[PDB]
Each structure stands twice: as structure tokens, then as C-alpha cells.
Amino acid sequence: HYFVALYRFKALEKDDLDFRPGEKITVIDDSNEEWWRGKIGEKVGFFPPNFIIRVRAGERVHRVTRSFVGNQITLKKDQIVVQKGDEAGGYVKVYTGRKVGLFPTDFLEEI
């Protein structure tokens, strides 16, 4: 299992982790529920856990590339979503952290 940033976090303190949507984060210390400690590349630091999403082993992470309302899920440009199942008919099920459902393969780019 691994973690991806859902949102931008800008470091406010020296020991803050700074990161962008889509970056992979290795969690060191998840003992505190307001502030986890983790690492990106060489940098170690603190960040708020709500800013990242856990991803199953071998799951695929995508950035939404175009705002699209569905009939079967809505998503906005630059959202981070996790892919569920395999594609079919130009769509695949993607998970937002709160909603699950089918979204156009062509409005996604993998990260």
C-alpha cells in the first residue's frame, strides 16, 4: 500500500513536508491524528493526513484532465482519483476518497 497527495500542501514550518497533488508520500509516523510525518525523495516532515489518500498495492492513480459531469460520476479538472476495476466502453470506475464510479478513460491521465 502507498499514499498519494490529494491536495497541495505548502510547508509553513521548517519540518513541514511540501507537496503537490499526485506526489507519492511514504508515511513514517502516523501516530498523531492532526500531523503525520512522512517522506518524499530526501525530504522528511510533517503534514495533515487529510491531504493524502491510501492506495492499494498495484492500484493505479490518475489525474482528471477535464471537468466532466456524468450520469456515472462527476469530477473536476486536476482531481486525483484511484482506479477501480478494469476499463470498459471508454470508462472505468475511479475512487475519489468518498465516491466510486465510472468516468471517461479519455478524461484521465495516469501518474
The domains found in the chain, sorted by start residue, are 2-55 (2.30.30.40), 61-110 (2.30.30.40)
The CA–CA distances, whole Å, from 97 to 12, 15, 89, 105 equal 25, 27, 24, 19
**How far from 24 is each of 37, 38, 101, CA to CA, in Å?**
13, 10, 23
Amino acid sitting at position 103: F
CA 34/CA 51 separation, integer angstroms: 11
Q: What is the resolution of this structure in A?
A: 2.1
The experimental method behind these coordinates is X-ray
